[PDB]
Amino acid sequence: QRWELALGRFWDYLRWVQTLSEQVQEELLSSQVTQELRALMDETMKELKAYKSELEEQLTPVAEETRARLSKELQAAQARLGADMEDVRGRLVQYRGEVQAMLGQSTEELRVRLASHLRKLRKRLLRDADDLQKRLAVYQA
Numbered sequence: 001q002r003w004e005l006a007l008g009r010f011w012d013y014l015r016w017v018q019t020l021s022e023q024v025q026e027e028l029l030s031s032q033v034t035q036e037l038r039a040l041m042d043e044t045m046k047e048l049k050a051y052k053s054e055l056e057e058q059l060t061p062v063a064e065e066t067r068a069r070l071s072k073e074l075q076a077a078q079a080r081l082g083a084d085m086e087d088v089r090g091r092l093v094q095y096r097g098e099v100q101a102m103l104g105q106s107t108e109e110l111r112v113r114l115a116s117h118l119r120k121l122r123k124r125l126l127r128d129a130d131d132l133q134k135r136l137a138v139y140q141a
């Protein structure tokens with residue numbers, strides 16, 4: 001699906017950031033990483049919204065209160081994914097500021113802690129994406 005390809009581009013970019021390789025460390029001190037992640041996030045959410053809209057052209061008819069609940073649950077799962085991606089962006093903005101405040105000192109232990117926290121944020125984003133995919137897969141029925 002288009003939205004899954006978009007999310008995959010976000011996910012591959014963030015897997016690269018997770019390596020904290022030399023070029024990642026460079027781009028993390030500019031706005032480049034968080035700006036490129038915002039663009040990838042925005043594209044994912046836009047495709048998600050269009051996909052839901054197109055699914056609603058091919059629904060199995062059910063009771064109005066049942067359809068309304070399923071649409072609400074799907075809306076909340078979309079919001080969770082967007083919030084996860086923002087949490088990742090925000091944590092990398094925080095890293096930038098904490099490095100500046102070190103005034104040139106070693107960032108090795110900042111990066112160890114960032115790597116650890118990024119792993120947890122990414123586990124959360126992955127489980128929310130899998131839950132959203134499952135909900136979309138049964139939505140039309």
Ligand SMILES: N=C(N)C1(c2cccc(Cl)c2)CCC1
Nearest residue numbers: 004007008011126129130133
């Ligand atoms: N095949 C998957 N598990 C999906 C996926 C793909 C890439 C990255 C992520 Cl986080 C999730 C597609 C929606 C769930």
